[PDB]
Design a protein around this ligand. Sequence first.
Ligand SMILES: *[C@@H]1O[C@H](CO)[C@@H](O[C@@H]2O[C@H](CO)[C@@H](O)[C@H](O)[C@H]2NC(C)=O)[C@H](O)[C@H]1NC(C)=O
Ligand SMILES: *[C@@H]1O[C@H](CO)[C@@H](O[C@@H]2O[C@H](CO)[C@@H](O)[C@H](O)[C@H]2NC(C)=O)[C@H](O)[C@H]1NC(C)=O
Lengths: 540, 540
Amino acid sequence: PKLLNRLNTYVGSSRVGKRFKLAERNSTFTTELRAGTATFLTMAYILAVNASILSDSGGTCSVSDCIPLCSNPAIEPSQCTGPGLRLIQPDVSCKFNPVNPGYAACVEEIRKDLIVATVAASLIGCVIMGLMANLPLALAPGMGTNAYFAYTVVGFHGSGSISYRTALAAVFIEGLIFLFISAIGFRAKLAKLVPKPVRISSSAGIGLFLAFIGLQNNQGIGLVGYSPSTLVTLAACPASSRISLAPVITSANGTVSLLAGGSVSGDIMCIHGRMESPTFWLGIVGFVIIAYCLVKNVKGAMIYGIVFVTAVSWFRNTEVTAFPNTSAGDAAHDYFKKIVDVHVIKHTAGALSFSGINKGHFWEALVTFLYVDILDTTGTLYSMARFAGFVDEKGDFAGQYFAFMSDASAIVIGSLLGTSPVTVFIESSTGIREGGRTGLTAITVAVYFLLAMFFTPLLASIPAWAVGPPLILVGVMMMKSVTEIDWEDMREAIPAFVTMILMPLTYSVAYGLIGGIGSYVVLHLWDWGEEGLVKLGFLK
Amino acid sequence: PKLLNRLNTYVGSSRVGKRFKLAERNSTFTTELRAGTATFLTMAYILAVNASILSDSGGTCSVSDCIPLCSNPAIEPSQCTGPGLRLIQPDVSCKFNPVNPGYAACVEEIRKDLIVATVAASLIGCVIMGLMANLPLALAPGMGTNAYFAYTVVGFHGSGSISYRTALAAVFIEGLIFLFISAIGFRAKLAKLVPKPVRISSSAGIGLFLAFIGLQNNQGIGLVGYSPSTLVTLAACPASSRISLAPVITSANGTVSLLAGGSVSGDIMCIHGRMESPTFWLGIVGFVIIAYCLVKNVKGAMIYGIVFVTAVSWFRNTEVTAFPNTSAGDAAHDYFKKIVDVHVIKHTAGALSFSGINKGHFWEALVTFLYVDILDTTGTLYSMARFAGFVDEKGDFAGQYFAFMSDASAIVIGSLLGTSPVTVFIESSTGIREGGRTGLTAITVAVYFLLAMFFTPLLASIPAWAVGPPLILVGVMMMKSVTEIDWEDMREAIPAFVTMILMPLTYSVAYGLIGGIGSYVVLHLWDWGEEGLVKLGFLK
Ligand SMILES: *[C@@H]1O[C@H](CO)[C@@H](O[C@@H]2O[C@H](CO)[C@@H](O)[C@H](O)[C@H]2NC(C)=O)[C@H](O)[C@H]1NC(C)=O
Ligand SMILES: *[C@@H]1O[C@H](CO)[C@@H](O[C@@H]2O[C@H](CO)[C@@H](O)[C@H](O)[C@H]2NC(C)=O)[C@H](O)[C@H]1NC(C)=O
């Protein structure tokens, strides 16, 4: 007969076929391969997004890599010898606008390291899940945790309260704690502490957070800029129409004096030319492409949008180029002209530090990660077990124990390689809908990730207006959880609204969670006291 | 027979009782009075909120009221005569921080004028509705239109693109157009142009906008401040820990130079002492009070929260005082020591100007108002007609014609007195639930508004941390519209999300509407073209 039939029969009757229980689950070999291909096509946008987001945090390097500069910018630093010409020693301000050249070079090196680390963590997680749990699930660094890790815990170019290495240690300890909790069966009971309205709306809140990042110049397409009155207005003017802000001291007559050592922002204020940014309109075109591909059920919509926007930007002498006519642009183009490369992680691997373990901020991060991974992983896996028909009458699908242990182990391993926590992707559903039932789907996704490695030069050249619409559409899709909040009941509607709006406005996830929980406790104090009084016996 | 029974019988058998159809609708006199009292108690927060919001726009006065200042702030301006001491002529920067004393005095005068105008517009609208339509509905200046009029169309202290008088003319013409449209029966047809997902989510969007205003230092309790990296972080530090920002020019070596004539912001950047602002915690206490009063179905919850927070602030030598130890504070206290006053509108009444009618921004405002009033009034009235049992099998409740004409006339009259458009309040439902069926409820609310006049000194002394939680809770209650969007369908979910998130982030309502409509058209182009091709006959 057909050669595929012979191959399927041979594999099913073999020893590895019985190991993976192919016959008992009604799927042979090619259904597994097709399901793995579909899942990889649906989740491949993480390869660009995660590396960009994590690289924005600055990585391991610090002020020690800034180089001394000349008195005038027109003279090369090594030729700054003459009357009144001296070398300026670097300070913290070298990390921020205008950025010192050495810092930017290090940041590019960190970006390559983080691409490789993302690929390796996804591969190891998928293989561990496939071999141990024997489930068709794919693991990769999560999205909300990426944004929270980069822009809040560590901050832009290390402007946060915790260094990169200490945050890696926090992720490591969180993974170990999650493993220990899942191994003794206290995970389900611990999941009950979070009140219901906070437990749901939080997801929506994160989506809003992500969307806001996509509407930002540092991070996405623009369209939102600084305003002296309202703090936020309509941006998206060309890069030559933007200026920075600096703190000043005023008086009661009208004088102003610049404040020494103050933080200078990026080019966030727009003077003229609104709605004229070419990169903004290129990002809009990519957004439209992804949205149409999502409506018509095309797999890999985000891949297509990102690839279109990136390929348009690879030309050199345009207004939307990714390789500007500078030294950094020329170096980036030179690395890009190499199509394939085998990059070895140099700075990011094995970069843990336990110095800040006694700080109060550290723990605020460690708990927050622990919350998200406990909820998300609990929410996703069971949902997946419903699509594959594994759930019995008791609500258990056998391999849940090893599924949770494998997720925790993947988190630990990813922390060792220098990336944000890894989780199970919801996109795995698209593989289950195609017929994947065993762990061969995870192995197939792992092989695809291995082949996605070796393309670091192509993945390291993706501009900010290409990582923009994917975040917005991810927020759109996360928004669907609001339909199960009872907005008629104030005692539920107030905490959910507080969580949802505080996540993007304070630009933090922990603050939204804290506000929601505090509001819930305050609003339920009276009822709890009345119940306690009735129970004790002072009241009827 | 009790005396109340005799009074009810006498009124019901009288001529005015037959005029208002008291007997035919099963309500006599005291049910009408009680329903009016309940409605007024539920809607009385507008008396403070609307005046504060509209006064933040600066009113009619301009740079011409700034007074010349001395070379040093320590010398009184009229004694600035000596070596090198001159008078600085005012410029536009006198309107912004630091604010010229004459401008602040004028703004206080405008605040009194706007309190009186708000009361008068509400009274006239209620009387016109009660006498003509004969419905138990109360009219007052709307909330989203207040915020849009003040902070977007006119801008803070006149920093927008349209002056106050031109915006009043826009409101006037919008009211006239709405009257003409409703009189010829094209209102229902015109209401169908807005796509459904935009037509719903817009309400939720406005709520978010309002909540953001309540989390702002200019406008509410604080908690959200400027950030050099993310533009927005956790504020709410004491007023002595805040500094301003000014635009600068950088170079490639590290120098910075202040830019001449740039806009200086308010005290928005926080250096230290986060979560230590006493006014922030007072606002939180007021928020909690209103939240419990809302949970337990207490009428006038917002009144109680506002009154508590305001009464705490009336003491003079504290950190939460509304009368600081300055000249402006002393003048405010002197006006407050008067309990009752008869204020006559001096600047705001009859201040229309038709100069900017050929500007493109003008029309962008005029349409936007016209949208909101067409939707909101259509959404509310019919809903009210369901609670009172007026809707027949055909969907009409007889007096809808005069109801819409009365709403339009009230809009025009309010525009003449110098306020944002007036609409029907949803809070009127609380009066219908109590038994109100005729127009005597509107007359009762009008009498209550008339007696609420004469208390301008008390209403003019309400601080910003008292107008804060009401806006947040109004946003919470408007948020309930999201449950009727199908978030599973991308072709609907994308426009709704775009509208909802663009309203508060760009800090404008028109931009959210434009984005939503544009996204809807773009996403439906392919389907519309395919349908048209099938209809014409080129396709099967
Ligand atoms: C960096 O280079 C600029 C010149 O490009 C220096 O600016 C001097 O000081 C102000 C501010 O720009 C200018 O008005 C002067 O014209 C500049 N003087 C000269 C001789 O160019 C700036 O001083 C340099 N940075 C430092 C720390 O010296
Ligand atoms: C306005 O008032 C200040 C004093 O309050 C005057 O003095 C200046 O103070 C700032 C610091 O706040 C210094 O940077 C300036 O060097 C001071 N200038 C002088 C001449 O002493 C200030 O001069 C006043 N401004 C004007 C235009 O008169």
